[PDB]
């Protein structure tokens, strides 16, 4: 079915880097408003990033300057590189397709846990 | 005879120029309208699409010998004119600066505009044409010359001498 | 006009006073790019274009040279070498209706960005990756344009703003639109420095008795000495005489 | 919910301040602007206060309006004898999508 | 600025009411300006019928829709209202009112007409 | 950035009855909203967006209401599986924007 499945979740030592990957099906990414969301264990959610259908992307302030959304249009997939993971960033990361005023986010990703060594 | 058309080509490929007089006013336009194989004989218009950049209007230019000098050198296109009572007459009379337009189109070719009442109109016709009154127009080409002009007590030119016509003039 | 249907216009061939604006309204947004707003009334331009439309409240920041967004990147974009400026004044007294003024829209979906001063009107149904929902609804078949829907209960961030954008030209300009003038009131009979419509000189000005022909503006004696000038205001002819000088 | 309610009587006395209430719901009084009109017997009403705090040119100063949550109030100062007439509420109802009014108060000074 | 209604004040049941608001001082082509109608029964509270903005937004009272048609003739500076299937409950006074712009919010009902008492009987 | 606050935190109602969740904003939120049902163990699921529009598929048992600064989700007849977490997500600023809530825990008997 139309879906986005994610990978890259795991554990990494502080100061390290990481890369989350998002594969899709039955739906395009190049022309679709993409949005990465995340959830700390037991807490709510927070919008992490967005890429527009023309490419002009945006990120939240809490993660501004450290995370970067990109998309392999050739094979219909999304990616988010993270760096300098500190003690806060331990959370499960979801890949999403947001429509907005005409219907809010519906199709979500299975998620991927991202914790740090300690 | 009711107007003129200037430009580097009659097609819409360049921002050609149009000047059309009328019983009411003069209408000046620069819009690159592609024209037919012949200027249409009025049945009021025949031209292609336009990308007009300038338009202007003012009072009309109306046996009476109308004389005109058209010059376009410095990015401006200038007109001089004169209307006199009455072949070319021998009388002396200077043309007065009528309009100086700032339009900088590179004009290379030019034609005239005719009209007629209850006349058919087609983009193209043979040398049969349509009926019209007896009339004629003369055309001459300017050259760089040295002229000696005489101004009167009132500031009007009354005579002129071609510095390079003959030895006495020189 | 709408954000995606701005009303382009040109304003040239005029003595443009860029300070008649200031008596209009509070001028909420007034900052000029490529030309100072203070030095606008004097400077001259080739062709002055004006684009007028209405946007939402919190999107007024997106109208700037080289600025990316959703109204800037999707339906109205101005160059990086832009010369002109933008003027925005909140107008929800004539634009916000009780219930939602569904008359002003904004391209929310598109394919890519648009070039500067690129206006598009197309109202086709946006794709869905595959063959879309032509003329229907479904999972994610979302039209590219979306209405603002102003109402008098929206916060100031969601209120309509009227906006005019002037695009100047300075490259190869045939000065047609600017405002100089300022005719220092005339003085006669004193050797004074004069500047008559560009003709600069010094001398005593006296009432003339010579009939300039109507297309003439200057008078010269032998050896090009500028002897007379007609007023660009009252068109009266005045004689110029160099003020007195001599040996002692 | 879709109709505004006002007390029918105010019953002041010259030079005093009185308040007139108007109760609505989440849909009309809680999400839109509340107007307040004035209607004399056998004559069209005449605007007094729009947008909960603004006065059309030609209304005296003594009338003030207030909206608070799901309630509305009109405050009349300097009560005088030329004011015994009807007072009306007005609001746009999103749930009904229409304008609704209140009953009206006499306000006859003693 | 003035508005005034006119038409037939007496009509049999199962007939139609027509009204004409002739105004002076504003035009229904500028932004903001709009014109509406407000009825008031004999001895009841006010009631809103319909509204028509300057951009041709034909708002109707929902419970009173499927019966009303309001239209403008701005060239003649007049508005026309039509209501089919009149009944004895529609005996009321009908005002035509004006909604313009303000200083921080559109104005609504700033000016009212003067009424036209309409009785529906035999 | 309008902060939404859901309430109550917990709710215990007999099976087969209604359930009422309120979420309150501090600025205007008119009809840019959504309600998510995050069954415990995977990503949330959109139920009702805007003011009261039910997302596709989403059982009719849900009803949304509210506008401005206050919204409410209502469940007609709770079945045993309705137990999950709920969040009202706003997008009054859509490109790029959202602001989540604190969530609500719903259970059965
Ligand atoms: C410098 C310039 O504009 N030259 C043009 C020339 O290219 C053109 O062939 C001619 C008429 O066609 O008019 C002139
Ligand atoms: C090279 C060139 O000028 N081509 C012109 C084009 O500019 C104009 O828009 C069109 C219609 O007028 O005619 C052709
Ligand atoms: C050659 C010439 O112009 N001479 C002028 C004449 O035009 C003018 O009418 C007259 C004044 O009455 O003075 C002399």
Numbering used by the authors:
A (entry chain I): 1 to 118
B (entry chain B): 101 to 142, 157 to 176, 187 to 210, 215 to 298
C (entry chain A): 348 to 595
D (entry chain L): 1 to 110
E (entry chain M): 2 to 123
F (entry chain H): 1 to 109
Authors' text:
In this study, we used single-cell sequencing technology to isolate hundreds of monoclonal antibodies from convalescent patients of BA.1 breakthrough infection and identified dozens of elite antibodies with NT50 values at the picomolar level. Next, we evaluated the epitopes of these elite antibodies and found that these antibodies mainly fall into two distinct groups, which was consistent with the results of the epitope competition assay.
Compared with a single antibody, four cocktails, TH003 + TH027, TH027 + TH132, TH027 + TH257 and TH272 + TH281, showed significant advantages against the BA.1.1 variant. For the 1 RBD in the down conformation, the Fab molecule can hardly be built due to poor electron density, indicating potential steric hindrance from the neighboring molecule. By structural analysis, we confirmed that the pairing strategy combining RBD-2a + RBD-5 communities could tolerate the key escape mutations of BA.4/5, including L452R and F486V, and could perfectly block the outer face and RBM face of the RBD simultaneously. TH027 and TH272 do not directly block the binding of the RBM but can tightly bind with both the up and down RBDs. Meanwhile, TH132 and TH281 target the RBM face of the RBD and can bind with the RBD only in the up conformation but recognize and tightly bind with residues that are crucial for RBD folding and ACE2 binding. In contrast, most alveolar septa and cavities were stained normally, and only small amounts of immune cell infiltration around bronchi/bronchioles and blood vessels were observed in both of the prophylactic or therapeutic groups. Therefore, these data demonstrated that TH027 + TH132 cocktail could effectively protect mice against SARS-CoV-2 infection either prophylactically or therapeutically.
